[PDB]
TrEMBL record, chain B:
MF GO annotations: DNA binding
Name under which the protein is recorded: Repressor protein
Top-level taxon of origin: Viruses
InterPro entries assigned to the protein according to its UniProt record, in alphabetical order: Lambda_DNA-bd_dom_sf (IPR010982)
Record organism: Ravinvirus N15
Amino acid sequence: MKPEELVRHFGDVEKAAVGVGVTPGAVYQWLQAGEIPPLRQSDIEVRTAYKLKSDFTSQRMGKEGH
Amino acid sequence: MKPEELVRHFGDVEKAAVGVGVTPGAVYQWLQAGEIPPLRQSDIEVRTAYKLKSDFTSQRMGKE
């Protein structure tokens, strides 16, 4: 999932940081980097009860290219 | 999931390491610690397409 997905899901950066167990500053650095670290994406997928999908899962669960 | 559950899933310790993208030494450390770190558990859960469940998921699902 892209960092803006994570923000859309929770509503804002502060709520996303609390939801995923990181600092707000970390979430802004994901936004700036245009990507959430993989290990971290897995945790977001699990901690949203699979509502957000890691790029790993998305890529495989695309009948095509996602 | 406990480290023993990870090992039971992939068969032997070294297959588990390959299976989830870590070194065998990491898996042995987890066995001796009696736990897998939380973020590694999530990654195992995702990389196994949910065949193994993190402690987080097991609690959510009422299947501890």
